[PDB]
């Protein structure tokens, strides 16, 4: 009688205290609405540029539209940012200065913003313990690793695509080799990725045309800046490709590519580790046996092993079964992997 009323009143108090969270959470956003409505009251600002300063207090501004004006100094700001050569902002009333406007390339934001999150990718590369060559034996992952450390820190996102040395006009790409590598020599930290270099890696065996001679001339600038009269002790380049046969044996000198990393799945612990990191979100039956999948797989591609395992998960979803036994893994990874061996020419 008395002992039950404390628990019952605890239940009424429970259902009474469980209704505040449905309102007090959205009231912060509702008040944030009026906070923004009070934040949109700072309006009517214009821009300008400073060329010549006569008086330390009042100088000449240059507007983007073309007409020039002169403004004063606001009591809040100081003479630090007031020096000429810094783009600033102005107001329509009294031509006061609220703050400055830092310059940037319309494109510099694109070249300095593309970023890729994910910090576990550095430890999701599997059992893998002045230039690096990522060649193309029967095993993939050249992009998941470079994008794994590049997604970890990379200190930048200086990606160099092999399609940026096209130079449709006269082949003066030396301005871009010295321009971008001059940016690499300017910025103290720099990491360079060179993916799919086989397209620009012509062996120039026979007499090349004008299209090949300019690309091989950019390769001559690469020679002149790797083993020429310029060291590359601090900058690092990652030459990724697809076929390790046409990789410019003139460029295959060990003076540039110190080590060679054959991206494959040789070790049973590396294939088992990559199989376990790719087999994370998949659900299976209690019968688990990875040694048959790892043992039967010999010299395959990592991401394509993910595509074959998920292809076996779809072969198992054809029968719309929630649980997925490893029989379709052995027979579907077996048969589909044999089809990859057929299409591995």
């Amino acid at each position: 009688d008395y002992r039950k009323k404390l628990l019952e009143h605890k239940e009424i108090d429970g259902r009474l205290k469980e209704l505040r969270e449905q309102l007090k959470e959205l009231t912060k956003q509702y008040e944030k609405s009026e906070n923004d409505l009070k934040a949109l009251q700072s309006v009517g600002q214009i821009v300008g540029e400073v060329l010549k300063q006569l008086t330390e207090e009042k100088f000449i501004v240059k507007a983007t539209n073309g007409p020039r004006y002169v403004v004063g100094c606001r009591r809040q700001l100081d003479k630090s940012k007031l020096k000429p050569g810094t783009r600033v902002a102005l107001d329509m009333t009294t031509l006061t200065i609220m703050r400055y406007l830092p310059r940037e390339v319309d494109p510099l934001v694109y070249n300095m913003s593309h970023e890729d999150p994910g910090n576990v990718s550095y430890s999701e590369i599997g059992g893998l313990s002045k230039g690096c060559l990522l060649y193309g034996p029967p095993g993939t992952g050249k992009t998941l690793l470079a994008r794994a450390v590049a997604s970890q820190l990379d200190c930048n996102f200086l990606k160099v695509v092999s399609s940026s040395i096209v130079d449709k006009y006269i082949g003066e790409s030396a301005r871009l080799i010295r321009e971008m590598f001059n940016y690499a020599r300017d910025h103290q930290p720099c990491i360079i990725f060179m993916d799919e270099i086989d397209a620009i890696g012509g062996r120039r065996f026979s007499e090349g045309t004008s299209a090949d001679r300019e690309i091989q001339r950019t390769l001559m600038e690469l020679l002149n800046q790797m083993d020429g009269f310029d060291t590359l002790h601090r900058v690092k380049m990652i030459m990724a490709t697809n076929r390790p046969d046409t990789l410019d044996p003139a460029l295959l000198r060990p003076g540039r590519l110190d080590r060679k990393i054959h991206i494959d799945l040789p070790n049973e612990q590396a294939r088992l580790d990559i199989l376990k990191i790719h087999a994370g979100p998949i659900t299976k039956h209690g019968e688990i046996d990875y040694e048959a999948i790892v043992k039967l797989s010999d010299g395959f591609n990592g991401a394509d092993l993910r595509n074959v395992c998920t292809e076996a998960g779809m072969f198992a979803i054809r029968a719309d079964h929630d649980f997925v036994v490893q029989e379709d893994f052995m027979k579907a990874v077996r048969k589909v992997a044999d089809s990859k061996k057929l299409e591995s020419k």
Partner: protein, 359 residues
């Protein structure tokens, strides 16, 4: 319960807040009614040293540059360098941002809602088309099971084979089953007179696929521009093409709308087209035999008044090394001269008459 009696005052304050938000929330309609012009927005992060640094660069349509910080409501897809933003008369604030992509010559390339033909128009290809029918039905309805199993559908499917096989009308026939928006694109459309057009066409395709609703983008004649030359125009198509491959390799959020491709020949096979997001689904579509051609010609000719005395042996013998769209042209031609033959019923000589007529 004496300590829990103060909750009533809190609920009265909250319902009073809901009663008082109607006015300041009501002026949203009269202040944010209509942005009268369109102004381009360029994102540029500033630093104030709360007193936090946040600003943006504005450009009006009349070529006038002004100054304003990043303001408005809660932004999720905003803060991108886009156009068609909300702005009042003279205060120049940002109220309603909406992406423009406007250059309608590329935006309105092929505005198709849905086609008429379906997958039940062919015969003898279920063993090789069933994988594609699954690969378009299960990624559209079974998104829930993709989290229990951890499955991400591939975005590049290579529908390759000899020409004239009707792969375009067949992929469109499956696009009727996709129920999504169908958007064609031709290979020779990337080669333009001006420079950098292919970047606008590719970023436009991923602008409508990325921005718009879940759709279907089927391209064809990709082999006509997929040449791996070692100036050259196909190397410019290597700039645009390798740019697209960079947008299918460097973009992990590419889990959105797929990109279906079809090549009429595999002579110049680009080796860089092998990836989970790239053209990994390589299902070979050979030339249909006389049996399969009699099947697709029978189902494509099931509407005309065909004579029941068809043993398919004469047409099976005459159809040697033919294709799907060729027998479709024989069916259409038979439906063309069968009208002027007087007999409303399709005869048996019209098959070889059309075969020797158009071929």
């Amino acid at each position: 319960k004496i300590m829990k009696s103060e909750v009533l005052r809190v609920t009265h304050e909250l319902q009073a807040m809901k009663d008082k938000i109607k006015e300041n929330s009501e002026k949203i309609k009269v202040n944010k009614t209509l942005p009268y012009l369109v102004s381009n927005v360029i994102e540029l992060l500033d630093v104030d040293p709360q007193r936090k640094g946040k600003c943006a660069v504005i450009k009006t349509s009349t070529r006038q540059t002004y100054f304003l910080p990043v303001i408005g409501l809660v932004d999720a897809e905003k803060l991108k360098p886009g156009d068609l933003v909300g702005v009042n008369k003279d205060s120049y604030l940002i109220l309603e941002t909406l992406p423009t992509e406007y250059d309608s010559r590329v935006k309105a390339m092929e505005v198709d809602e849905r086609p008429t033909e379906q997958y039940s128009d062919i015969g003898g290809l279920d063993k090789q088309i069933q994988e594609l029918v699954e690969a378009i039905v299960l990624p559209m309805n079974h998104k829930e099971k993709f989290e229990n199993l951890g499955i991400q559908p591939p975005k590049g499917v290579l529908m390759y084979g000899p020409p004239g096989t009707g792969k375009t009308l067949l992929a469109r026939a499956c696009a009727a089953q996709t129920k999504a928006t169908f958007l064609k694109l031709a290979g020779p459309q990337l080669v333009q007179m001006f420079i950098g057009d292919g970047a606008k066409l590719v970023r436009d395709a991923f602008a409508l696929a990325k921005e718009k609703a879940p759709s279907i983008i089927f391209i064809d004649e990709l082999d006509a521009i997929g040449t791996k030359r070692f100036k050259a125009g196909d190397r410019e198509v290597q700039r645009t093409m390798l740019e697209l491959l960079n947008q299918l390799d460097g973009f992990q959020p590419n889990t959105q709308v797929k990109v279906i491709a079809a090549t009429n020949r595999v002579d110049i096979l680009d080796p860089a087209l092998l990836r989970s997001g790239r053209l990994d689904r390589k299902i070979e579509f050979p030339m249909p035999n006389e049996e399969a051609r009699a099947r697709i010609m029978q189902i494509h000719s099931r509407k005309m008044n065909v004579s029941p005395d068809v043993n398919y042996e004469e047409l099976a013998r005459c159809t040697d090394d033919f294709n799907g769209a060729q027998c479709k042209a024989v069916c259409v031609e038979a439906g063309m001269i069968a009208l002027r033959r007087g007999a409303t019923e399709l005869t048996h000589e019209d098959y070889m008459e059309g075969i020797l007529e158009v071929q």
